Amino acid sequence: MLDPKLVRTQPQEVAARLATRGFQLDVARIEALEEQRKSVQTRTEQLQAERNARSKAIGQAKQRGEDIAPLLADVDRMGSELEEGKRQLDAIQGELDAMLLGIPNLPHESVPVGADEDANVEVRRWGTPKTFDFEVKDHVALGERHGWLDFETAAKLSGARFALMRGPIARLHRALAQFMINLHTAEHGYEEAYTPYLVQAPALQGTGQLPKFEEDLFKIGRDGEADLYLIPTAEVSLTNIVSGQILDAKQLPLKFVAHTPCFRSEADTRGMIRQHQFDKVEMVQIVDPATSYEALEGLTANAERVLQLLELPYRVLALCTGDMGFGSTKTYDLEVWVPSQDKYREISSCSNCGDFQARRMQARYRNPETGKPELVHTLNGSGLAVGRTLVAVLENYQQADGSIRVPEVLKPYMAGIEVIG
Amino acid sequence: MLDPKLVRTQPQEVAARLATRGFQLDVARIEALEEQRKSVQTRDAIQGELDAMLLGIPNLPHESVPVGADEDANVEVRRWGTPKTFDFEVKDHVALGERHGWLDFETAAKLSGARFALMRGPIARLHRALAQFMINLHTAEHGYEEAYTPYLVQAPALQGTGQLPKFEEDLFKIGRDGEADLYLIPTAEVSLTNIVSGQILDAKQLPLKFVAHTPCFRSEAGADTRGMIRQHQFDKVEMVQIVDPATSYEALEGLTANAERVLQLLELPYRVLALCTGDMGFGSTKTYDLEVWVPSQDKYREISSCSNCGDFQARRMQARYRNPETGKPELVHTLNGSGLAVGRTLVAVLENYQQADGSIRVPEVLKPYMAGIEVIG
Ligand SMILES: N[C@@H](CO)C(=O)NS(=O)(=O)OC[C@H]1O[C@@H](n2ccc(=O)[nH]c2=O)[C@H](O)[C@@H]1O
Numbered sequence: 001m002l003d004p005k006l007v008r009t010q011p012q013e014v015a016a017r018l019a020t021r022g023f024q025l026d027v028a029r030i031e032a033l034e035e036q037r038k039s040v041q042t043r044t045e046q047l048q049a050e051r052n053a054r055s056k057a058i059g060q061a062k063q064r065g066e067d068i069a070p071l072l073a074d075v076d077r078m079g080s081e082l083e084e085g086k087r088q089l090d091a092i093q094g095e096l097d098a099m100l101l102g103i104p105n106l107p108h109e110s111v112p113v114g115a116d117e118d119a120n121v122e123v124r125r126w127g128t129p130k131t132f133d134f135e136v137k138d139h140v141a142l143g144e145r146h147g148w149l150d151f152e153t154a155a156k157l158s159g160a161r162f163a164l165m166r167g168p169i170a171r172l173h174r175a176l177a178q179f180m181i182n183l184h185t186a187e188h189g190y191e192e193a194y195t196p197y198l199v200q201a202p203a204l205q206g207t208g209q210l211p212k213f214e215e216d217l218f219k220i221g222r223d224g225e226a227d228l229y230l231i232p233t234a235e236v237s238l239t240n241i242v243s244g245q246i247l248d249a250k251q252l253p254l255k256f257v258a259h260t261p262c263f264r265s266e267a268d269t270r271g272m273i274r275q276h277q278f279d280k281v282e283m284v285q286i287v288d289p290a291t292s293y294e295a296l297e298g299l300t301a302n303a304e305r306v307l308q309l310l311e312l313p314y315r316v317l318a319l320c321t322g323d324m325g326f327g328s329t330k331t332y333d334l335e336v337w338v339p340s341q342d343k344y345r346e347i348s349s350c351s352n353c354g355d356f357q358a359r360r361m362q363a364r365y366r367n368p369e370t371g372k373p374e375l376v377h378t379l380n381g382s383g384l385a386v387g388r389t390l391v392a393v394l395e396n397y398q399q400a401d402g403s404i405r406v407p408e409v410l411k412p413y414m415a416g417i418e419v420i421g
Numbered sequence: 422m423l424d425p426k427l428v429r430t431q432p433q434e435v436a437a438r439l440a441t442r443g444f445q446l447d448v449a450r451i452e453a454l455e456e457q458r459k460s461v462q463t464r465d466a467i468q469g470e471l472d473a474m475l476l477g478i479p480n481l482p483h484e485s486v487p488v489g490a491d492e493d494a495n496v497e498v499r500r501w502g503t504p505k506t507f508d509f510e511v512k513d514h515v516a517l518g519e520r521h522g523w524l525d526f527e528t529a530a531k532l533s534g535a536r537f538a539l540m541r542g543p544i545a546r547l548h549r550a551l552a553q554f555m556i557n558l559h560t561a562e563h564g565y566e567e568a569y570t571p572y573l574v575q576a577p578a579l580q581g582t583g584q585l586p587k588f589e590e591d592l593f594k595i596g597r598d599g600e601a602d603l604y605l606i607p608t609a610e611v612s613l614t615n616i617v618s619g620q621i622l623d624a625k626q627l628p629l630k631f632v633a634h635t636p637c638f639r640s641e642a643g644a645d646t647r648g649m650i651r652q653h654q655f656d657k658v659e660m661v662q663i664v665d666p667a668t669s670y671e672a673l674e675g676l677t678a679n680a681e682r683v684l685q686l687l688e689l690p691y692r693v694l695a696l697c698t699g700d701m702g703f704g705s706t707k708t709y710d711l712e713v714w715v716p717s718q719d720k721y722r723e724i725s726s727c728s729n730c731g732d733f734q735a736r737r738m739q740a741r742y743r744n745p746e747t748g749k750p751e752l753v754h755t756l757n758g759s760g761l762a763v764g765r766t767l768v769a770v771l772e773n774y775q776q777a778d779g780s781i782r783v784p785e786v787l788k789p790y791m792a793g794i795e796v797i798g
């Protein structure tokens with residue numbers, strides 16, 4: 001949600017900034033709803049003044065021995081219309097609230113203005129993509145050799161976009177997630193959390209997936225119970241820890257990390273790049289609004305540190321205005337080198353949401369200067385999507401015989417295995 | 422599913438064995454559908470109806486299973502360890518965990534409603550340490566091959582292990598428009614056992630031993646309103662075996678020993694119960710439950726269920742192996758056991774390891790996973 005006062009008073013300036021994202025704010029409907037509210041409000045003030053005067057005139061008419069029936073009838077009608085004016089004002093505000101829940105976040109002024117992914121800029125890259133002495137195999141070919149990466153059995157169980165891992169490939173995937181959580185908790189100041197993987201609709205509205213992106217979620221319909229949704233990311237469960245709260249400024253920043261499965265039914269056919277279920281180690285920050293853009297740089301560096309320690313070549317992209325997620329003011333995407341594709345592929349998105357999610361969940365902090373509750377800023381970033389990191393490890397660490405060399409940092413988690421297959 | 426030949430040649434003995442479970446075999450409806458189809462063929466709708474009945478029949482209990490009507494007829498076969506005598510008033514896991522916000526039911530209820538939990542900091546780390554310890558133990562010492570599986574399955578996998586068609590109400594279903602519906606797994610038994618469905622294994626591939634650490638999702642109305650003992654979501658480290666039928670009862674003893682070893686290493690006193698005929702799960706021929714000591718309850722509470730399913734799930738899945746003696750593809754036997762339910766192990770750890778001041782001693786085997794933490798709070 002954007003500042004409702006800003007949307008109502010400056011629709012044209014808000015529309016100009018949203019236009020950089022290719023989003024067309026319905027200024028005509030906002031102005032028409034505002035004109036309707038003003039018209040009804042002026043009528044209710046005129047009515048309130050009229051009714052109060054007629055009610056007091058009854059007392060005076062009684063003192064004169066006069067007929068109070070014309071005054072009682074005016075009071076009754078005026079009161080009835082005032083009740084309608086209230087239902088009208090609530091229905092107008094209700095329509096405006098529903099509209100304001102469908103508006104994307106305002107991009108920060110430091111975001112390059114662009115209409116598509118071609119206006120995204122490379123910020124930096126680290127590491128050199130290996131030049132192999134043989135014909136590179138993709139993760140599917142590498143993993144299928146001994147049945148340790150199995151899409152056929154997964155399809156037998158669950159249909160398309162699922163995977164089964166076994167033996168050393170299952171162990172490597174677990175080693176990756178453990179490595180990620182251990183790193184963020186030990187060196188990056190994150191507090192570990194285990195969360196529910198099923199949430200009700202208010203949590204999803206809090207982070208922005210609802211009301212607009214319901215179709216991308218798996219929903220569990222329940223008889224005379226609130227519906228449950230499978231989390232698309234731990235961002236939903238973690239960010240909502242602080243919903244409806246007034247935090248002490250001394251508690252900021254609140255830094256959370258969770259390793260969870262992530263479920264998406266969103267409308268890369270071969271492999272585990274795009275899945276209905278995938279593990280992701282998620283980093284979430286609840287911060288002082290004054291520090292959030294600096295916090296984003298640190299968040300992006302925490303995700304980068306995983307790729308650097310795994311010696312995986314990667315690139316950092318600054319997303320342009322036309323290529324950002326709904327709730328983001330600024331995003332950095334990390335893309336890892338994928339030998340079989342001869343290109344970098346997305347492995348993380350690190351975003352500053354500003355006060356947009358905090359407004360939807362009423363996540364506040366008490367400002368030390370004013371002593372008043374103010375909205376916190378929120379940030380989230382993948383550190384990292386675990387299945388995609390597995391794809392990157394298998395392909396970058398492949399040897400001539402189809403075996404996989406175990407990354408140095410993963411050897412303590414691999415029970416003596418240094419070479420897979 | 423039961424051997425259809427047995428249901429045909431011995432209906433009275435099969436009905437008498439099922440009666441010990443409190444199940445009444447509709448011998449008349451089977452005898453009628455057999456006499457009708459024999460007349461209909463002599464002169465496919467009757468088959469579809471018999472199949473539905475056949476799929477609603479629970480497994481035959483093994484002869485060694487104690488006969489009893491309910492949980493009060495369960496037999497304690499052995500125990501391990503001495504439940505600790507505390508020199509102060511014992512607190513439950515809820516009071517222990519809530520102290521610093523590290524176990525939070527309130528934030529979890531705000532997110533998802535009742536029967537969910539949020540863990541943070543050292544309690545979240547302790548839960549993760551428990552699941553890592555369990556999967557590391559079974560893979561290094563007990564011969565299990567690790568597996569990562571889907572947590573969403575379609576209806577055939579659940580029918581393969583027995584949750585479908587009879588127990589649909591206990592599952593969370595994701596209704597999908599113009600696609601087959603998905604169900605959240607109630608246990609990794611579902612995904613793991615179905616690995617071998619519709620296959621003919623080589624006898625040399627046996628025993629196939631799988632271990633997975635997965636969340637488990639259940640919506641059961643039949644069954645602990647306070648705490649994380651009963652949850653709509655809980656982690657569990659599942660052990661599954663696909664075996665040669667001649668070895669399955671010996672395999673059950675080894676599987677139960679694998680679950681017990683987790684409790685022994687964590688120094689958690691427990692007891693082993695042989696479930697009676699009337700307290701057995703639908704797909705089991707024989708079950709041992711492990712019940713861990715819970716100091717605030719002054720009793721042992723279920724933490725694991727280890728079962729031999731015989732050829733029941735193998736029949737539903739058409740999971741076979743080529744018998745080396747006959748050359749014929751024969752049904753395998755399947756087994757499954759919790760090694761262990763992670764949330765309930767965390768409950769057992771917080772309560773058994775609690776100190777007078779409300780702090781929690783870290784079990785010895787978990788100290789390598791706790792990043793220097795030896796005392797929680
Ligand atoms: N909470 C934020 C930051 O993690 C978020 O979820 N953003 S994201 O870009 O939608 O998702 C975060 C990351 O998840 C991975 N991913 C996505 C879809 C899929 O099928 N498989 C994947 O591995 C992508 O690499 C992506 O950068």
Ligand SMILES: N[C@@H](CO)C(=O)NS(=O)(=O)OC[C@H]1O[C@@H](n2ccc(=O)[nH]c2=O)[C@H](O)[C@@H]1O
Nearest residue numbers: 608610651652655723724725726757758759762
């Ligand atoms: N696949 C087999 C063997 O694990 C199986 O699922 N059996 S079981 O008994 O249904 O479930 C296995 C175990 O899961 C635990 N449990 C159960 C319900 C709940 O809400 N929370 C729990 O922690 C119980 O300790 C139980 O013994």
Ligand code: NA
Nearest residue numbers: 333346348349
């Ligand atoms: Na993205």
Ligand code: NA
Nearest residue numbers: 702723725726
């Ligand atoms: Na049980």
